[PDB]
Design a protein around this nucleic acid. Structure first.
Ligand SMILES: [Mg+2]
Ligand SMILES: [Mg+2]
Ligand SMILES: [Mg+2]
Ligand SMILES: [Mg+2]
Ligand SMILES: [Mg+2]
Ligand SMILES: [Mg+2]
Ligand SMILES: [Mg+2]
Ligand SMILES: [Mg+2]
Ligand SMILES: [Mg+2]
Ligand SMILES: [Mg+2]
Ligand SMILES: [Mg+2]
Ligand SMILES: [Mg+2]
Ligand SMILES: [Mg+2]
Ligand SMILES: [Mg+2]
Ligand SMILES: [Mg+2]
Ligand SMILES: [Mg+2]
Ligand SMILES: [Mg+2]
Ligand SMILES: [Mg+2]
Ligand SMILES: [Mg+2]
Ligand SMILES: [Mg+2]
Ligand SMILES: [Mg+2]
Ligand SMILES: [Mg+2]
Ligand SMILES: [Mg+2]
Ligand SMILES: [Mg+2]
Ligand SMILES: [Mg+2]
Ligand SMILES: [Mg+2]
Ligand SMILES: [Mg+2]
Ligand SMILES: [Mg+2]
Ligand SMILES: [Mg+2]
Ligand SMILES: [Mg+2]
Ligand SMILES: [Mg+2]
Ligand SMILES: [Mg+2]
Ligand SMILES: [Mg+2]
Ligand SMILES: [Mg+2]
Ligand SMILES: [Mg+2]
Ligand SMILES: [Mg+2]
Ligand SMILES: [Mg+2]
Ligand SMILES: [Mg+2]
Ligand SMILES: [Mg+2]
Ligand SMILES: [Mg+2]
Ligand SMILES: [Mg+2]
Ligand SMILES: [Mg+2]
Ligand SMILES: [Mg+2]
Ligand SMILES: [Mg+2]
Ligand SMILES: [Mg+2]
Ligand SMILES: [Mg+2]
Ligand SMILES: [Mg+2]
Ligand SMILES: [Mg+2]
Ligand SMILES: [Mg+2]
Ligand SMILES: [Mg+2]
Ligand SMILES: [Mg+2]
Ligand SMILES: [Mg+2]
Ligand SMILES: [Mg+2]
Ligand SMILES: [Mg+2]
Ligand SMILES: [Mg+2]
Ligand SMILES: [Mg+2]
Ligand SMILES: [Mg+2]
Ligand SMILES: [Mg+2]
Ligand SMILES: [Mg+2]
Ligand SMILES: [Mg+2]
Ligand SMILES: [Mg+2]
Ligand SMILES: [Mg+2]
Ligand SMILES: [Mg+2]
Ligand SMILES: [Mg+2]
Ligand SMILES: [Mg+2]
Ligand SMILES: [Mg+2]
Ligand SMILES: [Mg+2]
Ligand SMILES: [Mg+2]
Ligand SMILES: [Mg+2]
Ligand SMILES: [Mg+2]
Ligand SMILES: [Mg+2]
Ligand SMILES: [Mg+2]
Ligand SMILES: [Mg+2]
Ligand SMILES: [Mg+2]
Ligand SMILES: [Mg+2]
Ligand SMILES: [Mg+2]
Ligand SMILES: [Mg+2]
Ligand SMILES: [Mg+2]
Lengths: 158, 183, 62, 98, 149, 53
RNA sequence: ACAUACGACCAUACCUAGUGGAAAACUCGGGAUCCCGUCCGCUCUCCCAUAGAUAAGCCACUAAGGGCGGGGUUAGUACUCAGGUCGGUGACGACUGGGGAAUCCCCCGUGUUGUAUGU
RNA sequence: AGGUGUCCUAAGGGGGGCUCAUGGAGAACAGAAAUCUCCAGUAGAACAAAAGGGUAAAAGUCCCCUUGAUUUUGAUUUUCAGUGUGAAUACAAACCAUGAAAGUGUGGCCUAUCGAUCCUUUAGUCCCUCGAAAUUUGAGGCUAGAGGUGCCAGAAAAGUUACCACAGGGAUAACUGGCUUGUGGCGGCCAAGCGUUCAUAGCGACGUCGCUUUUUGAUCCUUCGAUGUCGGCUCUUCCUAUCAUACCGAAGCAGAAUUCGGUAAGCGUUGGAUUGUUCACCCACUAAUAGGGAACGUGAGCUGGGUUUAGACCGUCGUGAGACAG
RNA sequence: AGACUAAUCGAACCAUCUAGUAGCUGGUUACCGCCGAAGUUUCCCUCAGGAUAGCAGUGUCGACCUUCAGUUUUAUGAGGUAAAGCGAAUGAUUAGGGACUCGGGGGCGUUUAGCCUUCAUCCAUUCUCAAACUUUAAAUAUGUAAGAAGCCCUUGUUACUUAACUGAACGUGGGCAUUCGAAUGUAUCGACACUAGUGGGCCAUUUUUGGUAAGCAGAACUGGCGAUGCGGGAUGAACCG
RNA sequence: AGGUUUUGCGCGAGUGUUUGGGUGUAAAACCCGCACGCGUAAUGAAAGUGAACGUAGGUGAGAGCUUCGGCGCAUCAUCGA
């Protein structure tokens, strides 16, 4: 048996059905800054700057920006500890991450909520709550007569 | 069963000095009473440092005291729970009031000759029972030959254990590219 | 004689005994591996910023 | 493996510091000297009784060697060595394919 | 016990058999309870159950120690900043799930109940629906609390 | 067999060193003998100094 | 709204067949000295914008069109996580607390849009 | 199921023009296949080599120019101890290639294609040392490669022992036992067909379900500070899958002699030639000469014919010492 | 005859080197208290042994910092297993139909596109499949985030970048909270030092691979026994409690 | 005997009397000093060279003090000299 660099990447590194050929150029048109959070997804058509198969499907933080690639910090679990790994990835294997979009939209929503609450004199709720049990309510059967169901007898269908 | 990860976990800090010094025992009793009967965190810190081993009480030099006496600390009383040593490199000793566990002969002589004052910790407890207007100083804990050896390993630039220094002692194969690899 | 070849049976429990240590993050990361041109410029940018900050206290008054 | 008789590449010569033309030859190990310190020590150790005092390699496994190109600069005669990969048959200045 | 249910029981503070806790029903807590279903019996307590649990087996966590609730001074000292100054206040907060339910429930040391006075069902490690005692028995936990308390 | 971070041991005890151990329990007795010899030679050199210039 | 140039998504845009196309644009078009390139001015390159034509490209519409896309149905089915001193000789199955697909088949649709200059 | 120890001055680098496998129509020789033309043609071709990814105005193919397969030292990734080695990724110093550019290029589109210390040999400079002081030879250092360890983190290495020895191992074989039952043995269900006629008196294909541990395998759980290892003799008891004997039922049962089956282990199951035998086969008697277990029953019961240490011979094998389930 | 050489012979006896070496066998001496394993990683002429990491103890120290988590929720990525499919590619495979004009062969009334036939091709259908097939595609499990090292405004530094103060990075100054921006817990957070034993494991659910099978051999996750008593399963290392 | 880490002591930029000498109630105790060892400076194979721009630097933390404005130990991360 073998332990080469791209062992077991038959499907992960492959391009999807009817997804071959030309690479969209918005990938190259994107810009990245140090501290940005990016998702790593290996493009099989770009053999330069390929990250190892472990980092495929991982999310990290950009720590270095270069001509055609970014340095990403990932944390890899080995034995009983976490190791900080730094990988140089070409842009084609890097996608900006929505892993923080909810928080980044909540921070500004909370800012406007705070200023509006201060203006209006009544505090509002800034922190999200988990789904709560449903409240009491009344269901009218007017024009919604219940339909009585019974278990069906067994019969063969072949 | 109760399903606990930890049971009978002992505190990891010293509760008393391992020393058998009778005067240190008296000092510990005094500062136990002070730390119990006062609100000052200074007394508790001093009491805890009175338990510490010698490597946990590195010496403080007159030059180290002079560094911290600057920028509005000239009239504060310097408190060092350790030995205060002299420094040849400091030619002019500033006027200072220092309370320390002990002083070297040269340090005490130079402090007194510069118009300063030397105190013991019980004298400090008498004059400043709450540690008001005090500057509490610690010596360099890691400035020690043994610490230079700690954590030796590849790409860690620590000091190896060698019987001698020279070209024939740990300098080939594992330390340069001309001998296979470097570290 | 033959024996067992390999096993990961107890490794997860051994790893979790004292926790999986994740190195704590710091405010200022190491600039190791950063673009050397950027590092060379950043050195002098920091030099100038510190100089300007000192002149601000000494009379520049930005 | 066919390599040309000449190639122009970076020259480390103090006057060049520049891509210059170099003549290419195959490096050949020089004849072993009898007055190298290792040879002297080996002869001294082998003298007397005791038999063979050092190991003698037998378990040869390689069928090839790494070919080294000796490059001589055309302007200052500065020499440079370029190792190549293992190959069974090597020639320099051979006829090009069509 | 598998490690995930073990961790969830530790977070629910059910570290010992016949331990009992009050939980405010949300999605986050309901999912954890669903995971640890093979180890717990839970349900909907009534006022009698809450009152008797607090009065008989009421202990507060004071400075990391399990202190019996024999006086209103303890409750005022440890929960007075939340408007809870008496055992009836504590009972009201728990029963009505007030704004300080988290603080009240965490102040309450996990209840240490006895085995039920009438015993369990013939096989107690099935779901209540199957005829056992595990899972959600809804209002029927009041009889279990009356036997176990 | 090294097992930890140790200074490499080089204790030269691979010969039969116990056969040539030199203790010095006779240090005070030898000092006494030396003092006696000095006193005797000083007495012999009665008015002269005990040494040469 | 239509056309052109540069695009974005990359078939709702592809493929086949038929019908029609204001204005301008685009196109086919004409010539081979120069620049340039071919076996051949086919392509590429240059010069003309006169003439001819929307025949083709292009655009639009059509087709119980193939494909594609969306939805339903398949189906709470297949499967699967956890549980029992459950059933069954077994193969395997049912139940409890949860999650939950994919064909065939049926229905609908056949591009959206940015910048700039124009009609 | 396979692959590697190679191979390439291009099969490396840059740029440009083109579009492949195949199919349908056509054109003298010419046809199934030679060349020419058109139309379809998502890659069904090609890309050194295994397989898997990847690639269409290319990563294929042809053409033009070249040597980024260059110099310097770091950082990072995989195998990982986050050590080597092999590989690999992004950027800096330089000065080069190519395209009008933008840009690309630090060997092979990606995943394999390889090697420490010591020694040796090269390449590198107003470089260092030969320690009383100089010059010239010589030698030794510093930096970078090469000569190789394929048991590939890298000893310098032929047999035999039946004359054998020691420390151990039931971590590990040969004999009992244990699990299993392929195989061996013994049954059942089905019933094409045989049986003159008739599937089922009696046989019985293809298939299929089992049982047994009197075969042999498979495993290595017990025993290697030892459980005496074949057979025979002697002796007791047990099993039934019954050879004979008792009583019954069926026939392709007239009688006779047989055959099949049921209840049945109460009672018996022999004397000899050859062979150590087991097993077997003959001679003969008999109602019959059935099959098995009991640590493959039974060695402080025997015996020692077999296996069989040391002596010895032969054949084959070996240079030989010696080997042989001969 | 490897026979005999003082009961000693495939190299006698005596003394010494010598307490020769042994990764191997055996043994290793009072009590109580607290904590408490491993049979796994990498390298080794390594496979009955070592080193290395892990698991463990002890000693501390640090603000024990308001953080930490074998957990849930919410938001957002990755995957190619179970299932499904083959009138979808590749490959395997059962059956008939419709025509072609011929496409091969063979004929009947010969350049007669004459009229037949037997296969082949094509076509729209059909039965059944894949560890090294796939258009689809779960469950379980997995990466990241949920603030103060944040957010908003203004303008300072640079030798980098841009046509340019225009960006990049790091900041100065000012402001936020009538609420530090899910849940639950916190019955413990972090750093350091030195070192023990271990490096033969075995059993079980689910998923399995080889095998006819095995109380067989080999793996993934988790829990156990080893190291553990007690009630139950009569009897038992692992089962139930 | 040598090494290492951690305890407790003495002194501390020094430290160590006991090779030796003096002395003695005589293997004790007491006293003395030149040298020497280790430390105070590293780096390079070597020739050799050899450690302050700053109040011994800037940023973020940081116990404890604070005149309540900040001063900031140890230590950690970081950019510099
Ligand atoms: Mg208890
Ligand atoms: Mg490293
Ligand atoms: Mg060399
Ligand atoms: Mg060398
Ligand atoms: Mg073995
Ligand atoms: Mg093992
Ligand atoms: Mg620990
Ligand atoms: Mg030479
Ligand atoms: Mg000789
Ligand atoms: Mg009763
Ligand atoms: Mg019961
Ligand atoms: Mg000896
Ligand atoms: Mg193979
Ligand atoms: Mg190529
Ligand atoms: Mg080329
Ligand atoms: Mg090219
Ligand atoms: Mg091209
Ligand atoms: Mg392909
Ligand atoms: Mg050129
Ligand atoms: Mg590596
Ligand atoms: Mg490459
Ligand atoms: Mg470049
Ligand atoms: Mg080499
Ligand atoms: Mg060699
Ligand atoms: Mg040399
Ligand atoms: Mg000289
Ligand atoms: Mg060699
Ligand atoms: Mg090896
Ligand atoms: Mg065994
Ligand atoms: Mg059988
Ligand atoms: Mg029959
Ligand atoms: Mg058997
Ligand atoms: Mg056995
Ligand atoms: Mg035995
Ligand atoms: Mg025995
Ligand atoms: Mg016996
Ligand atoms: Mg016999
Ligand atoms: Mg019978
Ligand atoms: Mg019968
Ligand atoms: Mg009988
Ligand atoms: Mg038997
Ligand atoms: Mg027997
Ligand atoms: Mg017997
Ligand atoms: Mg016997
Ligand atoms: Mg016998
Ligand atoms: Mg015999
Ligand atoms: Mg014999
Ligand atoms: Mg024989
Ligand atoms: Mg013989
Ligand atoms: Mg004798
Ligand atoms: Mg004899
Ligand atoms: Mg002899
Ligand atoms: Mg003897
Ligand atoms: Mg314990
Ligand atoms: Mg080796
Ligand atoms: Mg053993
Ligand atoms: Mg699949
Ligand atoms: Mg797979
Ligand atoms: Mg399947
Ligand atoms: Mg198919
Ligand atoms: Mg097919
Ligand atoms: Mg599959
Ligand atoms: Mg998913
Ligand atoms: Mg997720
Ligand atoms: Mg260890
Ligand atoms: Mg090992
Ligand atoms: Mg170890
Ligand atoms: Mg074992
Ligand atoms: Mg097993
Ligand atoms: Mg086994
Ligand atoms: Mg054991
Ligand atoms: Mg137990
Ligand atoms: Mg029991
Ligand atoms: Mg058993
Ligand atoms: Mg010692
Ligand atoms: Mg000295
Ligand atoms: Mg020096
Ligand atoms: Mg503070």
């Amino acid at each position: 048996h073998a332990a080469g660099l791209r062992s077991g990447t038959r499907y992960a590194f492959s391009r999807g059905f009817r997804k071959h050929g030309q690479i969209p150029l918005s990938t190259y048109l994107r810009t990245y800054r140090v501290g940005d959070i990016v998702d790593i997804k290996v493009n099989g058509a770009v053999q330069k700057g390929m990250p190892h198969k472990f980092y495929h499907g991982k999310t990290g933080v950009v720590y270095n920006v270069t001509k055609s690639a970014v340095g990403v910090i990932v944390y890899k679990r080995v034995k009983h500890r976490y190791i900080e790994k730094r990988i140089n990835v070409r842009i084609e294997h890097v996608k900006p991450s929505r892993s923080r979009e909810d928080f980044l939209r909540r921070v500004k929503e909370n800012a406007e909520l705070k200023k509006k609450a201060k203006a209006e004199g009544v505090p509002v709720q800034l922190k999200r709550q988990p789904a709560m049990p449903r409240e009491a309510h009344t269901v009218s059967i007017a024009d919604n007569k219940p339909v009585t169901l019974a278990p069906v007898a067994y019969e063969t269908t072949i | 069963g109760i399903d606990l990860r930890w049971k009978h976990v002992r505190s990891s800090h010293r509760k008393a000095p391992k020393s058998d010094n009778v005067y240190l025992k008296l000092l510990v009793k005094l500062y136990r009473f002070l730390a119990r009967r006062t609100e000052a965190p200074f007394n508790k810190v001093v009491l805890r440092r009175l338990f510490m081993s010698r490597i946990n009480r590195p010496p403080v030099s007159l030059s180290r005291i002079a560094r911290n006496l600057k920028n509005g600390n000239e009239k504060k009383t310097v408190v060092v729970v350790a030995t205060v040593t002299d420094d040849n490199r400091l030619l002019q000793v500033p006027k200072m009031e220092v309370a320390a566990l002990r002083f070297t002969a040269k340090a005490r002589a130079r402090i007194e000759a510069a118009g300063g004052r030397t105190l013991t910790l019980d004298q400090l407890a008498l004059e400043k029972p709450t540690g008001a207007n005090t500057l509490l100083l610690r010596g360099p804990k890691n400035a020690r030959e043994a610490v230079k050896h700690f954590g030796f390993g590849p790409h860690k630039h620590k000091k190896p254990y060698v019987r001698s220094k020279g070209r024939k002692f740990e300098r080939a194969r594992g330390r340069r590219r001309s001998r296979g690899f470097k570290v | 004689a033959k024996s067992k070849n390999s096993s990961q049976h107890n490794q997860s429990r051994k790893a979790h005994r004292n926790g999986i240590k994740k190195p704590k993050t710091q405010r200022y990361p190491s600039l190791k591996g950063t673009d050397p041109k950027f590092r060379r410029n950043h050195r002098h940018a920091l030099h100038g910023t510190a100089k300007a900050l000192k002149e601000f206290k000494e009379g520049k008054r930005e | 493996v066919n390599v040309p008789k000449t190639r122009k590449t970076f020259c480390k010569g103090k006057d060049c510091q520049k891509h210059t033309l170099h003549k290419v030859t195959q490096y050949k190990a020089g004849k072993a000297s009898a007055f190298a310190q290792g040879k002297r020590r080996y002869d001294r150790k082998q003298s007397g009784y005791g038999g063979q005092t050092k190991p003698v390699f037998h378990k040869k496994a390689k069928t090839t060697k790494k070919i080294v190109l000796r490059l001589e600069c055309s302007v200052c005669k500065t020499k440079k060595q370029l190792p190549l990969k293992r190959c069974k048959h090597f020639e320099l200045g051979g006829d090009k394919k069509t | 016990i598998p490690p995930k249910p073990r961790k969830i029981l530790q977070l629910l503070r059910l570290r010992q058999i016949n331990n009992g806790v009050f939980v405010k029903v949300t999605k986050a807590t309901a999912e954890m309870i669903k995971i640890v279903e093979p180890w717990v019996a839970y349900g909907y307590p009534n006022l009698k159950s809450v009152r008797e649990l607090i009065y008989k087996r009421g202990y507060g966590k004071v400075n990391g120690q399990r202190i019996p609730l024999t006086d209103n001074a303890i409750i005022e000292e440890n929960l007075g900043k939340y408007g809870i100054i008496c055992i009836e206040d504590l009972i009201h907060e728990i029963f009505t799930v007030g704004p300080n339910f988290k603080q009240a429930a965490n102040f309450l040391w996990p209840f240490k109940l006895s085995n039920p006075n009438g015993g369990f069902r013939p096989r107690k490690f099935k779901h209540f629906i199957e005829g056992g005692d595990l899972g959600n028995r809804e209002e029927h936990i009041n009889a279990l609390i009356r036997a176990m308390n | 067999a090294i097992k930890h971070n140790q200074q490499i041991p080089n204790n030269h005890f691979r010969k039969h060193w116990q056969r040539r151990v030199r203790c010095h329990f006779d240090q005070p007795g030898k000092k006494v003998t030396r003092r006696l010899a000095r006193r005797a030679k000083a007495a012999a050199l009665a008015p002269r100094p005990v040494d040469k210039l």
